[PDB]
């Protein structure tokens, strides 16, 4: 059948946002190397870059921060609902629920004059919701993010109930930049489908989150890090890799091959972040050194011309090093990638709008005569 | 660059479920004409047809009813959250939120031994949720649906707190059949996109609902019906048509279709339902007679361009006759179409599964060197 499997070849839209050069292994947001953005900019500046199109001057940057800092509070029903949930609920399930309530209560209209500012407001509230989903699942009380010197600091402070170190803040800021956008996976796709009907911006995120909740999209950092936990020690790495992978059959996690020819540039930066925490904390070093050895084995026994660690291979270690339990890892992706979701759907609605409605190909039965039940 | 915008020519899957002949105006579910199903069957029989593939015998039909009747309960979090939201919230907002809570608390695994039975349970709870959304918005007390001789009766009784008449039960059962499936609109697309990541069934419905909440997909029954409310009386119909439609060149809502080039077979059946209610109720008759006259002017004007009454033209008058306020019309569509959503994602996951990841075409800025903030 002439089905577009996985929509693999299908260009669902154009974008001015993000460009992957898989051959040279370089990733750019709006023309800027992600290495420069991480090294010399910040999540707030990237927010302005993706939504408005250029890096912000001081005054524009201060306008971004001002919106964020006045936008952390969410409706009481969001918080009460989050904290009434059973504490073992999937964090993405809680997030999609939270965003349904945001939709129902704010129910923003689409409008060129305000879409960008709305997106910055949503980004603020995504921090509030993520931080308190952790706190809920831990059986703590709620804590709304408060204005501080950075978005990343405001988020971490609310999450953990104390002032983060400067190293923590920088790593978190880096992580928000690192996962802001890349390809058009099912979540971004779901968001675009919702935006094509002009469903409100919050509900477009609901759709994205609903797709991300699936284990073939969500869950990657979790599964990769769980390898290192199982291995337990660097001394154990070589045996584990032998009797699980080589004479095994179901394979290792956290390696890619499809997008980049040699190495994912994001993956490279997560590794450097992990490594930096490792020379400060023994438990982080233990997982980092395990990870390193598996990397060598995995690239050797599979060819370097082929595979590389993807972002998921070291991201969990950074997340762990920041204090986050494994059950938050996918949520920390969502916290970052929501910028890309927002930038993409605004791009679509304002510049390329078209209702999405694909075909099904009917097979299955030809016309038949109705048959009463006694005769069935 | 006029790429695959809208995905209109993309085949996203095959289906055994629904056949449409737009030339002769024929709709079939698994080979059976929609007229036979409405006239001689029931929603429970259609549930079994769509999910299991055939009309059920008495034993199989009793199994469907047994699952339904034991599955109306929802987590108390659902009630708590629904009833805590502002009474003016959009019903699909409230529904997408409710389904986020179900996904969080049930979090069902995909399993081909249980997927179909889980679908029936979800259909049970959709009635509970839709009934209580009505109740919340009217500041009424929650009420869970109870076992009864039929799904339509159980839904109607919970909603209005009163035993429905046999005509009401029959009209509701017909409605559930009539809107069960058709083409692959944005809601069905969003559910498929989520199912492609193996996101849990409830979250796949979450996704559908987020797409449905947009006014370019949801809201069609409401807008068509509101024409008649605005017309006010049958005597005013000709004046209104000439002013709004002929001179104002506005679109006649409830007319036209991408595939039907004759009368929507669904519109014929809704009309006959409306007709019957009209002869026993004066308020319904008022709107029916208005709708009749508009239909005549509409056909005279547009018939020659193969533009005819579609399924949304008469549906709202039916929902009105059943006692439903206008703000519930699209929810009642969701209540029916969920069978189609579920049938489609089960087909996809069990028989056609492929992770979905379309492409974006990069235009936008060439590579450029970082620019410190003082130079911006």
Residue numbers in the entry:
A (entry chain B), B (entry chain A): 3 to 378
Sentences from the paper on this structure:
ST1805-CS is related closely to CS from the same genus Sulfolobus solfataricus (SS-CS), and they share 68% amino acid sequence identity. In this crystal, the asymmetric unit contains two monomers having nearly identical overall structures. The final model is comprised of 376 amino acid residues per subunit (two residues in the N-terminus are disordered), 341 water molecules, a glycerol molecule, and a sulfate ion. The dimeric structure is further strengthened by an extended C-terminal loop, which involves a β-strand interacting with the first β-strand (residues 13–17) in the N-terminus of the other subunit. In ST1805-CS, three arginine-glutamate pairs Arg370-Glu56′, Glu368-Arg30′, and Arg356-Glu10′ are formed, of which the new β-strand made across both termini from each subunit lies between the former two pairs and the latter one. In ST1805-CS, an ion pair network was comprised of three residues; Asp109 in GI loop and Asp202 in LM loop were salt-bridged with Lys215′ in M′N′ loop of neighboring subunit.
We confirmed these two isozymes to function in high temperatures as CS and determined the crystal structures of them at resolutions of 2.0 Å and 2.7 Å, respectively.
